């Protein structure tokens, strides 16, 4: 059995999330997207908990479906240095045991969907660990509220205490990740962080997960890869696109090597601007081994479908002509990551030549990236050979 999951979302009781954060708008764009899991997440919120209860039907003590959507209980909590951290629960009793142990170190478990924590990483990482509660560090890589931002290493951050797993973040894939060998050892997540319901942010980032059902325990199985469960693939956002992937100034956007910006004392010398450090140079500075596991699951990388067709259309986002066309590819086929991932590159063609040649061309990394940094986001363009050749011819066709 093979299903796909995002672990990580918002509720509406989240800061600057929106209000369309209910179960039933999510359970029904996770239809339309393809995701057959989804995280609660904000589970340590009491008001979230209640209409989760109201919302949906029990699975088993772990495992919610609301909709035809099936969901577990997750959360993301925020310690002492302002570093996230995501907690999977395996019970509403671990949550409750959970929400009273850390209760007197916060003051906002109530009236916040992402509760303030006065503790360290440690003390987070060992109370979870204790009610066997799974953790790890939210979004490592990101430039914000991250891991590696206030930290050099795992072990500077959580100490004699355990991690399940690393989320990798919109701002990094697997390959990335692995230059730093601590985290060979550790299982990657990849989720979408998702601040609205919509299809081009729910989903935004998943993982696909072999698994015998759909229970938390099994995708506790495929997180530690057990027993025949597994992640199959993680997909997300190119992270060469990133608005802070290179070093760049913030002003004129100029790539600049690390080292030449720390001599420059961070001034672009091209119009005096403040250069910012990237996130690959970021990791690079961490680098420590040129391999990576060799069970590693694959990283796709992948836009919404939405976000392919403004682009092939030439249209915006929003636009009457890139809502008919993606309503017509999820009117064929039942979702948006079957077109993404799983649809031969002829099946789309029937639908849209010009959509087919561009998600070809995602799933073979044949597209020409100019990368993002110091703020603006990278560019992406399909090769000249790829739109002149026949679909039939793609794999054929020399490139560059
Ligand atoms: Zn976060
Ligand atoms: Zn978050
Ligand atoms: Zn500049």
């Not at 989720?191 to 059902?213: C, I, T």
């Not at 636009?319 to 990551?337: H, Q």
Request: charged content about 30%; glycine content about 8%.
């Amino acid at each position: 059995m093979v299903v796909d999951g995002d672990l990580h979302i918002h509720s509406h009781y989240s800061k600057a999330v929106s209000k369309l954060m209910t179960f039933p708008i999510i359970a029904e764009n996770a239809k339309l997207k393809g995701l057959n899991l989804v995280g609660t997440g904000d589970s340590l919120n009491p008001h979230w908990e209640k209409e989760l209860l109201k919302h949906s039907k029990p699975i088993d003590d772990g495992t919610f479906e609301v909709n035809g959507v099936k969901f577990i209980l997750t959360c993301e909590v925020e310690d002492k240095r302002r570093v996230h951290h995501l907690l999977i629960f395996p019970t509403l009793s671990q949550v409750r045991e959970f929400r009273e142990k850390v209760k007197i170190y916060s003051t906002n478990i109530e009236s916040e969907g992402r509760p303030n924590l006065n503790l360290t990483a440690e003390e987070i990482a060992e109370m979870a660990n204790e009610l066997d509660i799974l953790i790890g560090p939210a979004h490592a890589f990101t430039p914000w509220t991250s891991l590696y931002k206030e930290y050099d290493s795992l072990k500077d951050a959580y100490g004699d205490a355990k991690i399940d797993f690393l989320e990798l973040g919109l701002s990094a894939d697997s390959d990335m990740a692995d230059m730093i060998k601590a985290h060979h050892s550790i299982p990657y997540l990849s989720n979408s962080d998702a601040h609205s319901p919509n299809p081009h942010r729910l989903g935004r980032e998943f993982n696909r997960f072999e698994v015998k059902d759909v229970t938390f325990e099994e995708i506790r199985k495929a997180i530690k890869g057990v027993g025949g469960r597994k992640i199959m693939l993680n997909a997300g956002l190119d992270p060469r696109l990133g608005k802070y992937h290179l070093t760049a100034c913030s002003r004129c956007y100029t790539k600049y090597t690390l080292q030449d910006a720390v001599s420059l004392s961070w001034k672009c010398p091209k119009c005096g601007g403040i250069i910012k450090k990237g996130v690959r140079d970021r990791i690079l500075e961490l680098a420590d081994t040129s391999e990576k596991p060799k069970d590693r699951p694959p990283y796709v990388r992948l836009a919404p479908l939405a976000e392919i067709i403004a682009m092939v259309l030439g249209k915006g986002i929003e636009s009457k002509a890139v809502k008919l066309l993606w309503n017509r590819f999820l009117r064929e086929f039942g979702s948006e990551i079957r077109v993404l991932i799983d649809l031969p590159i002829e099946s789309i063609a029937s639908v849209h030549e010009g959509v087919a040649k561009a998600i070809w061309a995602y799933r073979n990394n044949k597209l020409i990236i100019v990368p993002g940094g110091g703020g603006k986001y990278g560019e992406i363009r399909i090769p000249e050979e790829i739109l002149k050749a026949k679909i039939e011819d793609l794999n054929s066709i020399e490139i560059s």
